[PDB]
Amino acid sequence: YFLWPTSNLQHCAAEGRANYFGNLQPKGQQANSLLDLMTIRAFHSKILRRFSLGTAVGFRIRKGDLTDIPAILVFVARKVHKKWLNPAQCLPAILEGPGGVWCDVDVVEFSYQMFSELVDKLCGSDECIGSGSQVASHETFGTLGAIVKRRTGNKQVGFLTNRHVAVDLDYPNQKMFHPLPPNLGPGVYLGAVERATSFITDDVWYGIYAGTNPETFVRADGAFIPFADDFDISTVTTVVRGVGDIGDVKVIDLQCPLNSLIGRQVCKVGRSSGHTTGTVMAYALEYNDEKGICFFTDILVVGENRQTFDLEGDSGSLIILTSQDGEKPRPIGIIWGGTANRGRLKLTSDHGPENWTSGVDLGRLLDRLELDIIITNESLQDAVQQQ
Amino acid sequence: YFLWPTSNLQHCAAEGRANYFGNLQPKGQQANSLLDLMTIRAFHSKILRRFSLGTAVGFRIRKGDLTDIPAILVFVARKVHKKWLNPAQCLPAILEGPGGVWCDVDVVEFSYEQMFSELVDKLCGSDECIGSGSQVASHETFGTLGAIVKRRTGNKQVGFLTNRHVAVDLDYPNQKMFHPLPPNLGPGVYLGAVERATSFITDDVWYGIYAGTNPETFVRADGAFIPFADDFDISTVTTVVRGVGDIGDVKVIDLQCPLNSLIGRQVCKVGRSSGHTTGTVMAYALEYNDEKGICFFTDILVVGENRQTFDLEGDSGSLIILTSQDGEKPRPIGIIWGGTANRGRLKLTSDHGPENWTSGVDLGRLLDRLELDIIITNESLQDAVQQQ
Amino acid sequence: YFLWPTSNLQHCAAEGRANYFGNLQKGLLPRHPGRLPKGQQANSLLDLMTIRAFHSKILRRFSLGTAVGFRIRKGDLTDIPAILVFVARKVHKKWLNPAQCLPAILEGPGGVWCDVDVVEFSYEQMFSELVDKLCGSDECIGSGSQVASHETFGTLGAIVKRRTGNKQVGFLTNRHVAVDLDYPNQKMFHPLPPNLGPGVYLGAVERATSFITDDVWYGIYAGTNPETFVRADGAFIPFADDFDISTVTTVVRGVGDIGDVKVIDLQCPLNSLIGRQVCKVGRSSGHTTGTVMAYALEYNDEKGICFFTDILVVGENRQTFDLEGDSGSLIILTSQDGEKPRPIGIIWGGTANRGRLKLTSDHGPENWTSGVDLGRLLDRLELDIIITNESLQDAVQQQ
Amino acid sequence: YFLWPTSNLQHCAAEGRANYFGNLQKGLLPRHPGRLPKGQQANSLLDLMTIRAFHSKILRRFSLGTAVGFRIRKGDLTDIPAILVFVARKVHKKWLNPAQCLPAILEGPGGVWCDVDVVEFSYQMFSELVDKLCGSDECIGSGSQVASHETFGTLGAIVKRRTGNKQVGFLTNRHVAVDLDYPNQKMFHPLPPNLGPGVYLGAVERATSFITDDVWYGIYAGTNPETFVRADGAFIPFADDFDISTVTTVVRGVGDIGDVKVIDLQCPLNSLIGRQVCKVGRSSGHTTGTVMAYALEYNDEKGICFFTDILVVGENRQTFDLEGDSGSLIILTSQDGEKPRPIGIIWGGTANRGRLKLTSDHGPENWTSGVDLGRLLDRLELDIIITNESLQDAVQQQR
Ligand SMILES: Nc1ncnc2c1ncn2[C@@H]1O[C@H](COP(=O)(O)OP(=O)(O)OP(=O)(O)O)[C@@H](O)[C@H]1O
Ligand SMILES: Nc1ncnc2c1ncn2[C@@H]1O[C@H](COP(=O)(O)OP(=O)(O)OP(=O)(O)O)[C@@H](O)[C@H]1O
Ligand SMILES: Nc1ncnc2c1ncn2[C@@H]1O[C@H](COP(=O)(O)OP(=O)(O)OP(=O)(O)O)[C@@H](O)[C@H]1O
Ligand SMILES: Nc1ncnc2c1ncn2[C@@H]1O[C@H](COP(=O)(O)OP(=O)(O)OP(=O)(O)O)[C@@H](O)[C@H]1O
Ligand SMILES: [Mg+2]
Ligand SMILES: [Mg+2]
Ligand SMILES: [Mg+2]
Ligand SMILES: [Mg+2]
């Protein structure tokens, strides 16, 4: 018994969005934050969607390296010289949005098992369940992202993993086991999915009109599972194995400087690939997936030293910023997985394309789900008694 | 976001079910209604699912014909003579449930592309009006418009009712419906989007009783409601079920009313794929034998008459209608359930082969969990058109 | 622990065959004339085999196989002794180079002759009261009842009894129903094995035969190839010690009480087997009727081995005679003069089992069915067929 | 004519097997739950098998099979007698309900006890030697490729028959030298005539598929009344016209080998378990490995229980065999100063080649199954020939 919106997604906010764009229509103070870059792309969403496989915001990638030039990333199937494009297809080097603020436009060529002691510990060989532990429904396997606790209601303690790992269609309930479901091997029952989110409109997720398409949604796939009534929550640790103690979530501020997210180093620990490291390359990837529907996904990561950042089954690991000042590493997202048709991007000519990985903004996901992540075992036992 | 139960399905309502069976634990007062048959089957559900392909309630089937004997139907893969069964596998002819009430138990052999007529063409866009039986398509699947309904609570907008997995996908953030074809495949008018749908409902809120001892028991209630779009001409919507005529209001399936008013009755439906077909109710409350650790129920079981299959793929959403036996308006009692994959039959006589049976959803109960009231006349339609 | 022959299938007895044919055509010559007199005509199956065997090199030269019987002309079986030669696609004489066309007459050893005609040749369920009764809905087991191993379904041929040893009573079905290779035991159930449904345990396969050389089966050298075998697949299962034999009947439902086996004599006149009407009752297609069309069907494969099959049946009134799963049914001669119907074979099941052949041009291709000589199989397995319920209890006791 | 038992594998020896378990009541009064005398620790494979057999009821409880040998701890073989229990995925004790956790010690009848270990379990090469083994060499020996008209394999050893004519031949496992469509099984090196050049080696005179546990080991190795040993092996005598002078007994890449080392169930454990073995095969050349277990148990899909004798894993992370090595002679490395002796032949194939997890720093590793040569040579009545001179003696002693 679900409910979509009744008539408020057609000609009350469909022309209300066209009003924000219907109204507002050279050395000038170039864009400083993601908030500026997103608006520039949104205004030009017609000529940018005209020939592209998708767009994103970040820094311009020049001769294989990330620059310090704020730019809108435009993805194409095959990058060719300017000599093989009819004039309708070539893109300008610079765009101007509302209010004179500007940015660059560069082209990026784009397309849509490990064995270690740590991988075994995450797959049931350890004596504790935490971030990185394998979590499985009756069909698919995944990764437990983070220990969270509910804000309203019972204030029940549970964990957070992304959608399509913990939810299937034919089954009427979604039970989760570690490390295997009973129909496949041994495992302990963790609980069931109480509430999860699939799609959120851009204005409620980002706060702005990230596009002119009246049907624009955000791939915010994330699920919350409260620990079962008869489950021993004392076997849960908050130590991110292989990383250590982590801090609280740093929200992705659209107004802070660009290079505080773009280019920063991130790492994760996953069920399938252990501890891998990567670099954030873009933000707010736009659909260019023709159905008339516009989809967004927040984080885009690429692995370091040409090694892939994730594998199939890592869906649900915690995307964690590596410590730059000896502080506690703080998470900003959780790795999203799907659909498994995997996709590459081309950086250099002496090497082939490299696998990129998408993620969901943790700061925004924890808010629309009303959850607070637990960072130490002492603060955990507090929420255990609040139940 | 969604909202599933927090701790209310494990050892709060699991002991309320375990109590109903913990507490309870011939010669005249035989079962009279579906409620009696369901309780007897539920109490003996442990020793019944032990060797069976499924169970259902209804009348005993002897030599291919429905008798007047209330009985619990037990489905097997292949029926053999009593001489080849060890006594642990043979089933008793009579069961006695709680309170001395009893009933019979008989065995039924059981197992789990388009017609061409002027009526089928009218349903696929050749007519000048959209109604029950008209083809409704998303960008992926085809279906059948079941009935014109209107929402009771909230606003009062008029729309139509079709079953789920025609109107719902997982990837889309909205599900648009078109007649007779989606824009990406041919011509068509926009009908609207799916406002709400239900997939599974627990037995205790659906029937009102504990139909089984399995703590995880659900009802395959796949059905969706679509409000007509702002730019759609609601004047092209008719309430006449083509091939049947003007229909009455929903006949609710009362578990307490006498058996022979539903079991055995003659039924018909009009669908996108097979037009106007006739059939017979054979059982009720068919349970799962589907090995997911889950116990699934389906309310109506229909078999086509004169050896011809009752439905085909694409009929999903058709209105199951009781034929008029006294002269009143024919009344709907169910809507055809989807799936139609895995193609499963039942064997009635030995001189003829198996026949295809069709699943349905109880219309009277589904219209309440979706908060809808069916409209049967054009004047009653124009009322809801202005009541918006 | 299986056992093949010792060295006796290479040289010695192998050349023993070569000699029997090396004797002839060192010592056998027609005179001049090719207007051969009609007293030397082939009269029996044995005569036709000797002509075919001697001429096997030119017969398997361009052919899909050969067989002996009556000439088939314009869709009707005649009473003319002939060697049937099978081809892939039959064409007019004008499109054949002289090396491929076949002579109308062959002259075998001793002047004996016969005709040669050409036939173009190639290699889902019923619903009736009888088929259900045969598949476990009846209260008695007999001929035609469904018998199943853990993989495949079949048909019980006949109630038989062993000659030597304990003399235990059992039933007869063909090998490809009752034998698989992964399993170390062969359990048989009616109508279904426990891993598929309900059923009663009938017993296990005690003893079966797969291939027999032509000289041990027929008694003659039916071909010049030293590696020549007969597809004699048949298996014997004794009823279990704890089985209730009181539910076993010998009445072939739809046929009645049958007589004793009529052995196929290679020397008797042709028309006592060729052309005779036969019928069977099977698990998969019930009671169908057909007609014997040939005998000793020969087929050489791309490995150098020569295979034989005894009976060739085609269904009557263009209805197919059998379906897949009918493997093991009893081929019974219909009673012509009020006498007891007698069985002559059992339906064989395999890869070269259900091919098609074209008889008339106004009708499509028709399915032929293979069989094994019942009289000869009962000797290789040392079994005697039981025909009445009283004759059963007599044999039930002597274990 | 095929044969199987009549009433002796059904309640003759099924109560005889149930008897063994029932002169084993053990008192209905238990041991003391503290210490145990170390004179009762398992010393031989025979002791380990009986302990495993008695507890077979609780061992099938959430496990896919068992075997006997030494405990494998943190990736290394110890010398501690233990019963290996195979699981689908090994997990911590914290995720097991008490019905699934396994005891560290088991005590059998008569006080004998042992450890219980857990193992995670699941069910070509180009070199100068491999070319010589595949027809580029001028001599036939152990390791040379042997092929039927369908499949390729590896010649195990030059053997001679014990009874009868006493004919010289070679030994390979059954699924390499035996097919079921063919009525004969011809062997060629290196290719059959339908695929390439090759010389005719001979035909299969005898083969074995399954042997009951009581006749194979000498004891009742399990509680299941239907228990068999996968003893697939076939014997081919050299053809009548074949040149046996090109046959050598020198195992190329190993050297001259000694006589067969019989697997004594009563001798000390560590003389088989843990010993180093090597083989030369058609598909993977000369590889070396380590014996890891014995008497591998498996129940599938009916009441029927299958056993396999030898379990080997390759050394230094290299796989021990590949497909096509089926039939190679597995030889333990040199008896300390003497000549290496063979103990088995690689079975190879359908389900008998799976993986097992040893360390977390490495992925899974391929294990290879084998059958006891000492026991296989007895059911087939064959004697292994070890030198070229001893071969020429029996060649003319043939009858
Ligand atoms: N629609 C298009 N489809 C394909 N290729 C295009 C399209 N528009 C532009 N290009 C190509 O992309 C080039 C622009 O590359 P870009 O802006 O990324 O350069 P850069 O960042 O300075 O350096 P580099 O490409 O070495 O990283 C154009 O010169 C042209 O060849
Ligand atoms: N578990 C079972 N599996 C298969 N067949 C069974 C099983 N239990 C009983 N039977 C068969 O079902 C028969 C009884 O069938 P049933 O109860 O349907 O009889 P009925 O309704 O009086 O008549 P009819 O056969 O016409 O339906 C038994 O005689 C037995 O042969
Ligand atoms: N090698 C061959 N391949 C194909 N067709 C052949 C071959 N040899 C002969 N034929 C054809 O077969 C014909 C002989 O047919 P056959 O002996 O069956 O005649 P029939 O019995 O008198 O009549 P009918 O053709 O009506 O049965 C030849 O006329 C020729 O067309
Ligand atoms: N049924 C079972 N399925 C899966 N795992 C099991 C089962 N029973 C026990 N285990 C696991 O197997 C472990 C025993 O491991 P094992 O006997 O191999 O120990 P070890 O040899 O001392 O050390 P190591 O595990 O490093 O080889 C138990 O601690 C438990 O985690
Ligand atoms: Mg660039
Ligand atoms: Mg009945
Ligand atoms: Mg002819
Ligand atoms: Mg260990």
mmCIF file of C-alpha atoms in Angstrom, chain C residues 27-190:
data_model
loop_
_atom_site.group_PDB
_atom_site.id
_atom_site.type_symbol
_atom_site.label_atom_id
_atom_site.label_comp_id
_atom_site.label_asym_id
_atom_site.label_seq_id
_atom_site.Cartn_x
_atom_site.Cartn_y
_atom_site.Cartn_z
ATOM 1 C CA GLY C 27 33.391 -71.568 -56.088
ATOM 2 C CA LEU C 28 30.276 -69.785 -57.382
ATOM 3 C CA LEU C 29 29.567 -68.424 -60.937
ATOM 4 C CA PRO C 30 26.364 -67.722 -63.017
ATOM 5 C CA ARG C 31 26.407 -69.304 -66.372
ATOM 6 C CA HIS C 32 26.062 -66.543 -68.883
ATOM 7 C CA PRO C 33 22.410 -65.719 -68.665
ATOM 8 C CA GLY C 34 20.521 -63.017 -66.789
ATOM 9 C CA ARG C 35 16.984 -64.331 -67.485
ATOM 10 C CA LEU C 36 17.074 -66.498 -64.330
ATOM 11 C CA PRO C 37 14.561 -69.342 -63.941
ATOM 12 C CA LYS C 38 11.750 -69.107 -61.419
ATOM 13 C CA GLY C 39 12.195 -72.078 -59.193
ATOM 14 C CA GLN C 40 15.223 -70.675 -57.377
ATOM 15 C CA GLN C 41 13.185 -67.763 -56.000
ATOM 16 C CA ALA C 42 13.681 -66.741 -52.384
ATOM 17 C CA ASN C 43 11.030 -68.309 -50.149
ATOM 18 C CA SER C 44 12.094 -67.521 -46.566
ATOM 19 C CA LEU C 45 13.829 -64.827 -44.536
ATOM 20 C CA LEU C 46 16.973 -66.986 -44.499
ATOM 21 C CA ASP C 47 17.199 -66.929 -48.304
ATOM 22 C CA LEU C 48 16.846 -63.140 -48.480
ATOM 23 C CA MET C 49 19.531 -62.656 -45.815
ATOM 24 C CA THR C 50 22.054 -64.791 -47.712
ATOM 25 C CA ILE C 51 21.610 -62.758 -50.903
ATOM 26 C CA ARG C 52 21.876 -59.492 -48.955
ATOM 27 C CA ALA C 53 24.886 -60.657 -46.924
ATOM 28 C CA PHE C 54 26.870 -61.788 -49.971
ATOM 29 C CA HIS C 55 26.139 -58.529 -51.836
ATOM 30 C CA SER C 56 26.693 -56.324 -48.771
ATOM 31 C CA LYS C 57 29.593 -54.390 -50.323
ATOM 32 C CA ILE C 58 27.583 -52.996 -53.248
ATOM 33 C CA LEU C 59 24.454 -52.658 -51.090
ATOM 34 C CA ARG C 60 26.037 -50.466 -48.407
ATOM 35 C CA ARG C 61 27.943 -48.673 -51.195
ATOM 36 C CA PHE C 62 25.364 -45.881 -51.616
ATOM 37 C CA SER C 63 22.603 -46.560 -49.079
ATOM 38 C CA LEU C 64 21.382 -45.649 -45.610
ATOM 39 C CA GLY C 65 20.676 -49.294 -44.762
ATOM 40 C CA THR C 66 19.025 -52.480 -45.971
ATOM 41 C CA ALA C 67 16.384 -54.959 -44.833
ATOM 42 C CA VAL C 68 14.545 -58.039 -46.070
ATOM 43 C CA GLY C 69 10.836 -58.510 -46.678
ATOM 44 C CA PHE C 70 8.278 -57.833 -49.411
ATOM 45 C CA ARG C 71 8.549 -55.273 -52.201
ATOM 46 C CA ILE C 72 6.727 -52.006 -51.465
ATOM 47 C CA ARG C 73 5.094 -50.665 -54.640
ATOM 48 C CA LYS C 74 3.004 -47.466 -54.825
ATOM 49 C CA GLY C 75 2.347 -47.531 -51.091
ATOM 50 C CA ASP C 76 1.035 -51.102 -50.781
ATOM 51 C CA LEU C 77 2.853 -54.149 -49.458
ATOM 52 C CA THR C 78 3.026 -56.888 -52.085
ATOM 53 C CA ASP C 79 3.760 -60.610 -51.639
ATOM 54 C CA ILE C 80 6.972 -60.423 -53.704
ATOM 55 C CA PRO C 81 10.161 -61.408 -51.811
ATOM 56 C CA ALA C 82 12.534 -58.461 -52.047
ATOM 57 C CA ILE C 83 15.547 -56.800 -50.439
ATOM 58 C CA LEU C 84 14.559 -53.325 -49.250
ATOM 59 C CA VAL C 85 17.267 -50.702 -49.847
ATOM 60 C CA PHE C 86 16.938 -47.412 -47.967
ATOM 61 C CA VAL C 87 18.017 -44.077 -49.461
ATOM 62 C CA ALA C 88 18.051 -40.509 -48.173
ATOM 63 C CA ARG C 89 15.886 -39.041 -50.956
ATOM 64 C CA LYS C 90 14.380 -41.113 -53.762
ATOM 65 C CA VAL C 91 14.672 -39.662 -57.279
ATOM 66 C CA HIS C 92 13.959 -40.723 -60.851
ATOM 67 C CA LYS C 93 16.414 -42.937 -62.720
ATOM 68 C CA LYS C 94 17.307 -40.077 -65.084
ATOM 69 C CA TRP C 95 19.115 -38.139 -62.318
ATOM 70 C CA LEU C 96 21.361 -41.028 -61.194
ATOM 71 C CA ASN C 97 24.767 -41.785 -62.647
ATOM 72 C CA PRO C 98 25.012 -45.492 -63.562
ATOM 73 C CA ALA C 99 27.197 -46.213 -60.515
ATOM 74 C CA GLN C 100 24.347 -45.384 -58.106
ATOM 75 C CA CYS C 101 21.291 -47.034 -59.679
ATOM 76 C CA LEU C 102 20.491 -50.454 -58.248
ATOM 77 C CA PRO C 103 19.590 -53.620 -60.172
ATOM 78 C CA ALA C 104 16.038 -54.891 -59.916
ATOM 79 C CA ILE C 105 17.247 -58.460 -59.241
ATOM 80 C CA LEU C 106 20.186 -59.931 -57.319
ATOM 81 C CA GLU C 107 21.535 -63.471 -57.728
ATOM 82 C CA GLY C 108 22.838 -64.935 -54.484
ATOM 83 C CA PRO C 109 24.728 -68.143 -53.743
ATOM 84 C CA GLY C 110 23.412 -71.259 -55.429
ATOM 85 C CA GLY C 111 21.413 -69.352 -58.037
ATOM 86 C CA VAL C 112 18.830 -68.151 -55.501
ATOM 87 C CA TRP C 113 17.480 -64.714 -56.404
ATOM 88 C CA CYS C 114 15.048 -62.013 -55.269
ATOM 89 C CA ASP C 115 13.839 -58.509 -56.091
ATOM 90 C CA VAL C 116 15.302 -55.196 -54.888
ATOM 91 C CA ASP C 117 13.142 -52.105 -54.349
ATOM 92 C CA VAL C 118 14.034 -48.634 -53.063
ATOM 93 C CA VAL C 119 12.441 -46.770 -50.139
ATOM 94 C CA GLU C 120 13.366 -43.262 -49.003
ATOM 95 C CA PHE C 121 14.225 -43.466 -45.343
ATOM 96 C CA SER C 122 15.387 -41.444 -42.349
ATOM 97 C CA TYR C 123 16.408 -41.998 -38.733
ATOM 98 C CA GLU C 124 3.086 -35.405 -27.388
ATOM 99 C CA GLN C 125 0.811 -37.548 -25.220
ATOM 100 C CA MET C 126 -2.461 -39.473 -25.320
ATOM 101 C CA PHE C 127 -5.388 -39.076 -22.921
ATOM 102 C CA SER C 128 -7.660 -42.071 -22.352
ATOM 103 C CA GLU C 129 -9.085 -44.245 -19.593
ATOM 104 C CA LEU C 130 -6.579 -46.972 -20.491
ATOM 105 C CA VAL C 131 -3.517 -44.702 -20.359
ATOM 106 C CA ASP C 132 -4.456 -43.510 -16.870
ATOM 107 C CA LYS C 133 -5.073 -47.095 -15.729
ATOM 108 C CA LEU C 134 -1.622 -47.990 -17.082
ATOM 109 C CA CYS C 135 0.003 -45.072 -15.214
ATOM 110 C CA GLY C 136 -0.986 -46.064 -11.672
ATOM 111 C CA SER C 137 -4.732 -45.368 -11.615
ATOM 112 C CA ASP C 138 -5.492 -49.107 -11.806
ATOM 113 C CA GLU C 139 -5.388 -51.541 -8.890
ATOM 114 C CA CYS C 140 -3.285 -54.160 -10.694
ATOM 115 C CA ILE C 141 0.090 -54.318 -12.437
ATOM 116 C CA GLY C 142 0.348 -55.989 -15.830
ATOM 117 C CA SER C 143 1.628 -55.572 -19.363
ATOM 118 C CA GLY C 144 1.577 -51.896 -20.316
ATOM 119 C CA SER C 145 1.863 -50.488 -16.790
ATOM 120 C CA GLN C 146 4.298 -47.619 -16.332
ATOM 121 C CA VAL C 147 7.700 -48.622 -14.938
ATOM 122 C CA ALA C 148 10.247 -45.950 -14.064
ATOM 123 C CA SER C 149 13.881 -45.753 -13.038
ATOM 124 C CA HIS C 150 15.232 -42.615 -11.388
ATOM 125 C CA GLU C 151 15.612 -40.938 -14.810
ATOM 126 C CA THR C 152 13.328 -42.310 -17.542
ATOM 127 C CA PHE C 153 9.893 -43.890 -17.970
ATOM 128 C CA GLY C 154 9.098 -47.147 -19.741
ATOM 129 C CA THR C 155 6.670 -50.034 -20.219
ATOM 130 C CA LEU C 156 6.490 -53.468 -18.599
ATOM 131 C CA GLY C 157 6.599 -56.015 -21.404
ATOM 132 C CA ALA C 158 5.563 -59.368 -19.941
ATOM 133 C CA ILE C 159 5.523 -61.450 -16.774
ATOM 134 C CA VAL C 160 8.437 -63.891 -17.117
ATOM 135 C CA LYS C 161 10.174 -66.468 -14.937
ATOM 136 C CA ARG C 162 13.824 -67.488 -14.771
ATOM 137 C CA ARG C 163 14.899 -70.952 -15.927
ATOM 138 C CA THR C 164 18.124 -71.521 -13.959
ATOM 139 C CA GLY C 165 19.118 -70.622 -10.419
ATOM 140 C CA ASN C 166 16.498 -69.673 -7.835
ATOM 141 C CA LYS C 167 13.782 -69.501 -10.542
ATOM 142 C CA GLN C 168 12.387 -66.168 -9.356
ATOM 143 C CA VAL C 169 9.487 -64.502 -11.178
ATOM 144 C CA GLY C 170 9.794 -60.998 -12.556
ATOM 145 C CA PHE C 171 9.013 -58.751 -15.500
ATOM 146 C CA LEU C 172 10.714 -57.826 -18.775
ATOM 147 C CA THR C 173 11.483 -54.335 -20.095
ATOM 148 C CA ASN C 174 14.102 -53.061 -22.514
ATOM 149 C CA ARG C 175 17.501 -51.897 -21.300
ATOM 150 C CA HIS C 176 17.339 -48.203 -22.234
ATOM 151 C CA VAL C 177 14.460 -47.762 -19.763
ATOM 152 C CA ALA C 178 15.909 -49.658 -16.797
ATOM 153 C CA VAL C 179 19.658 -48.922 -17.028
ATOM 154 C CA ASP C 180 21.684 -45.756 -16.461
ATOM 155 C CA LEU C 181 25.439 -45.434 -16.025
ATOM 156 C CA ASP C 182 25.913 -43.093 -13.055
ATOM 157 C CA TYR C 183 23.824 -45.214 -10.677
ATOM 158 C CA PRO C 184 25.310 -48.365 -9.094
ATOM 159 C CA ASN C 185 21.820 -49.848 -8.690
ATOM 160 C CA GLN C 186 18.789 -49.843 -10.978
ATOM 161 C CA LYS C 187 15.592 -49.381 -8.976
ATOM 162 C CA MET C 188 12.234 -49.594 -10.742
ATOM 163 C CA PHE C 189 8.967 -48.173 -9.431
ATOM 164 C CA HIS C 190 5.344 -47.992 -10.494
#
